[PDB]
Structures are given as C-alpha cells and as structure tokens.
Design a protein around this ligand. Structure first.
Ligand SMILES: CO[C@@H]1O[C@H](CO)[C@@H](O[C@@H]2O[C@H](CO)[C@@H](S)[C@H](O)[C@H]2O)[C@H](O)[C@H]1O
Ligand SMILES: OC[C@H]1O[C@@H](O[C@H]2[C@H](O)[C@@H](O)[C@H](O)O[C@@H]2CO)[C@H](O)[C@@H](O)[C@@H]1O
Length: 275
C-alpha cells in the first residue's frame, strides 16, 4: 500500500503537517524534513514530536554543507555524529535518515560530481559507512538508512551505483527527480514521470532494498501538470513495483512545485494519492 509523504514547504510544525493533510485530503504517512550538519537533535525534536504525534514516519535529509566526504571519512565530524546518534537513540522512535543525498549530481559539496573534485566513490562510501558505524556503536538501531540517487547523473564521475555503500549499510534506496517543464534556461523540457525516473529505478531495482521516491514534483509550464500527476501515481503503482513510498516536494521555489500550483493540479493530486 503506497505510502504518501511530503516536504510540506516549511519545517513540519504541527500546524504545517495538519494544513498539508487538509490540503491533500488525506493523512501523510511520511513527513520529510531537511537539516544540516550544524543542527543539533534538540532543534529537530519539536518537529519530530509533531510528526510522531500525527502518526507519521519522519524522514530527515541530513545535508553536510559543513563537511565534505574526506573530512567525514577521516573522522573530523565524529563528535557531532556521535552526539546525533546518542540523541536519536534516546528519542527511540523510528527515523528514516538520508545523509549525503543526490551525490551523483554536481550541486552539493559532498557530491561526486561537485567541481572541487574532493569526493570520489571511495571517499563517499567510506563516509557513509563511517556514519552508520557510529550510529550502530551508540545503539541507534531505530535509525533506518536511506541511500539516494538523483534521477540523472550530472557532473564528472557520477553514476547510480558507483557510490553505493552496500546492503549492510542501507535499509532503503531512493530517487529524487523533477519535471522542470520549460522553466529552466539550460533548456529544460517537459518529461513524464517515466522519462524522469525509469533509468534510475532500473539501476536501483538491482538492489534488494525497497525504494522511496524521496522527492518529486512537476512544474505547471510546458505541459499539463494535472495529467502528469495522474499518470505519475498510475505509473508508480503499475510499473514501479519496488517503490513503497512517494514523497512530494511541496514548495514554491525554483518554480511552483506545490500540489496547489493550480486548482487542476490540486484536484488531480487529491484523487491520485487515493486511500
Ligand atoms: C531540494 O533541495 C533542497 O530543498 C530543501 C527545502 O527547501 C532545503 O531545505 C533546507 O535545509 C536546511 C538544512 O540544510 C534547513 S536549515 C532549511 O530549513 C530547509 O529549508 C535544502 O537545503 C535543499 O538542498
Ligand atoms: O533533481 C533535483 C536537483 O536538480 C538539479 O538540476 C538538475 C536535474 O536534477 C537534472 O535532472 C538535470 O538533467 O540537470 C539539472 C542540472 O542542474 C538542481 O540543480 C538541484 O538544485 C536540485 O536539487
């Protein structure tokens, strides 16, 4: 039964969660939050409490703007990692944790494609494994590890599986991707869900872990977003059998990714998610 999640456009306060649930006409199974590597668990706790009080799973994308893969694998962030592991163990509830995401792009400073050239398959895998090792040493077995790829490899040296840290360090795999429509000056084009996600899915389907669509959305311009939404959820349920969760990215950001970017898109989203 496909789990429905979202990043709701802001940090997931009680009110932010309830407002999105009202908006989409259905409970959120998963609530998505982003934090960095200078954020303590105490800052997360109030949000985590809201999510668990609502009866949802918290998925945290944990973004090391503050440390590259060399410094992580070498142990320079270990006090901070240990602290987080300690705090998450004490909290006790099941958290899905997605460190070092979209590493097959070139936009994040921990990514293999990043133009500093600091990050390799080897440094990435060593860093990921090191994080997981520290969590396990501190008894944080409630923390489930989410590997991730961007839908497209962007930048030098990037691939779907070169940076895969291995089944022993991973609970879920995941894919991020957007239909940018005609919104970007690099000549973005309208792409169906299948055109965005099939290649990455084909790679991840070779790993015996369940798959999350951890971020997805579509622009309005360049095509019919309402139809896109209908077809995306149909595609997931028809042809992406290993996908267990679809987590929308609801933010009015580069473009209007929101499920209510138009009344038509909202109507389509409400019917698509079902249940
Ligand atoms: C899709 O890529 C990303 O978008 C999210 C949501 O806008 C953004 O989240 C921010 O993450 C910050 C931690 O690094 C925290 S403090 C912000 O509150 C949150 O909005 C990601 O940074 C970005 O990569
Ligand atoms: O996919 C999320 C990610 O997209 C980045 O743009 C990419 C895009 O992912 C890819 O599909 C396309 O072929 O190339 C562009 C090049 O940028 C975007 O830069 C990120 O901020 C965003 O997180």
């Amino acid at each position: 039964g496909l789990k429905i999640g979202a990043w709701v456009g802001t940090q997931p306060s009680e009110s932010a969660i309830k407002s999105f649930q009202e908006l989409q006409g259905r409970k959120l199974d998963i609530v998505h939050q982003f934090i960095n590597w200078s954020t303590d668990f105490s800052w997360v706790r109030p949000y985590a409490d809201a999510v668990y009080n609502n009866g949802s799973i918290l998925m945290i994308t944990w973004e090391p703007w503050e440390y590259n893969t060399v410094d992580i694998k070498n142990g320079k962030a270990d006090a901070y990692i240990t602290r987080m592991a300690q705090d998450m163990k004490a909290y006790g509830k099941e958290i899905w944790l997605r460190p070092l995401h979209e590493a097959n792009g070139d936009w994040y400073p921990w990514a293999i494609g990043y133009s500093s050239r600091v990050n390799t398959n080897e440094t990435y895998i060593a860093a990921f494994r090191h994080i997981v090792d520290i969590f396990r040493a501190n008894g944080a077995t409630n923390v489930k590890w989410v590997f991730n790829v961007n839908c497209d490899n962007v930048g030098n040296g990037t691939s779907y599986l070169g940076h895969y840290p291995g089944d022993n360090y991973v609970d879920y795999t995941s894919i991020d991707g957007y239909n940018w429509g005609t919104t970007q000056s690099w000549g973005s084009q309208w792409q169906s869900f299948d055109q965005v996600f099939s290649r990455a899915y084909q790679a991840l389907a070779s790993i015996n872990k369940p798959i999350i669509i951890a971020e997805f959305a579509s622009a309005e311009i360049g095509g019919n977003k309402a139809r896109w939404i209908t077809e995306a959820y149909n595609s997931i349920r028809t042809s992406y059998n290993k996908v267990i969760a679809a987590v929308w990215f609801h933010e009015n950001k580069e473009t209007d990714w929101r499920i209510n970017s138009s009344p038509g898109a909202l109507a389509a989203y409400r019917e698509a998610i079902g249940a």
